[PDB]
Structure 1
Amino acid sequence: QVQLQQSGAELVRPGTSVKVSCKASGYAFTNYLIEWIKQRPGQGLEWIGVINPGSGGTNYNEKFRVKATLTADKSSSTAYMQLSSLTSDDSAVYFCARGGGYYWGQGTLVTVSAASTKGPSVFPLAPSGTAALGCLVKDYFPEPVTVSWNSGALTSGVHTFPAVLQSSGLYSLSSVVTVPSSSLGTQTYICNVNHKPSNTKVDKKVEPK
């Protein structure tokens, strides 16, 4: 079973450089090409370039010739993409893909910003034969926040909304769930909020008021 494991999300300052990695497993790394693709939020796919790990040879899209540098380390089965002189236009998800189009990495989110990391505040959206309840995750930076319910045991009827950018420059999101009204007195409902950039982990119990 083949896997292309990419490095984690990066929050990087304007004018600096960032280097993302793509680690191959389950196949002979040096026998296949590695391509890099850019996806801006809510936008399409753009091709950056390609490298042959078994020779060191590269080809770039002219739009990324100045900005990007593709390398590969045969010893650690890893491909790297370095982006220089970072701007907000570089904020995107970057994917590595093995030649042939079948095998893709999971993507690496890059946010280019001078703003500070900030953890969210989590507030209950208390319920009043179906009840709606939820959690409001307010004022965090950067993205992402993940939300689960009852430590992953509750998945049916959950909607976790895409975050919105507030006028303050901070993000906010809500996650809701509909459940049987008859369960409000017998079942504990907890939203598990995780904001990795600020190490925030909140497990908010949502009680009927």
Structure 2
Amino acid sequence: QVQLQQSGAELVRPGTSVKVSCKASGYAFTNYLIEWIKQRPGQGLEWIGVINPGSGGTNYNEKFRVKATLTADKSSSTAYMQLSSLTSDDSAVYFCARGGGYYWGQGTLVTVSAASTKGPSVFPLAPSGTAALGCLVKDYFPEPVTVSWNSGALTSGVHTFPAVLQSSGLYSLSSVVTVPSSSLGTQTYICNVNHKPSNTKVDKKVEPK
């Protein structure tokens, strides 16, 4: 089974350089091209360029010729993309894909900012034959925050909303779940919040007040 494993999310300063990786497994890396694609938040797909890992040959979109450098290491079956002179316009998800686009990496989020990392505060949205309850994940930077319920055992009826950027420059998000009213006294509901950039892990129990 083929996999293209991309490096984790990056929070990088403006004017610096970032180098993202795409590690291939499940096939002969040097026998297929690797293409790189940019996706700005809420926008479409833009093609950056392509490398042949067997020869080292590359082709770039003119729009990325100055900014991007594609490399590949045969010994580690890894393709790399370095972006230089970073600006807020470079904040996006970058994907690697095997030539033709059947197999894709999972994407690497790149956030270009001089702002400091900040972990969130988690507050309950306490429930008042269906009840709604949730968690408010406030004042964090950068994205993303992930939320699960009951360590992943509770998925039906969950809605984790897109984060919003507040005037402060900090993000906030809410996650809600609807459950049977009859369960409020017998079932513990916990929202598990993870903000990897700040190593924040909060498991907030949400009780009827």
Residue by residue over 1:103-137, the C-alpha shift from the partner in whole angstroms, topping out at 9 and shown as x without a partner, is: 00000000000000000000000001000000000
**Secondary structure class of the residue paired with 1:182:** helix
CA distance in 2 between counterparts of 1:203 and 1:75 reads 42
CA distance in 2 between counterparts of 1:166 and 1:59 reads 40
Per the alignment, residue 185 of structure 1 pairs with 185
Instruction: Return the offset for 1:100.
Output: 1.7
CA distance in 2 between counterparts of 1:91 and 1:68 reads 14
Instruction: Return the offset for 1:44.
Output: 0.1
CA distance in 1 between counterparts of 2:16 and 2:100 reads 33
Residue by residue over 1:125-162, the C-alpha shift from the partner in whole angstroms, topping out at 9 and shown as x without a partner, is: 00010000000000000000000000000000000000
RMSD value, Cα = 0.2
What stretches of structure 1 of length at least 5 have no aligned partner?
Answer: none
Report the number of matched residues. 209
Instruction: Return the offset for 1:101.
Output: 1.1
Instruction: Return the offset for 1:21.
Output: 0.2
Runs ≥4 residues deviating over 6 A: none
Per the alignment, residue 94 of structure 2 pairs with 94
CA distance in 1 between counterparts of 2:153 and 2:21 reads 33
Under a length normalisation based on structure 2, what TM-score does the superposition of the two structures give? 1.00
Residue by residue over 1:148-190, the C-alpha shift from the partner in whole angstroms, topping out at 9 and shown as x without a partner, is: 0000000000000000000000000000000000000000000
What stretches of structure 2 of length at least 5 have no aligned partner?
Answer: none
Under a length normalisation based on structure 1, what TM-score does the superposition of the two structures give? 1.00
CA distance in 2 between counterparts of 1:163 and 1:194 reads 14
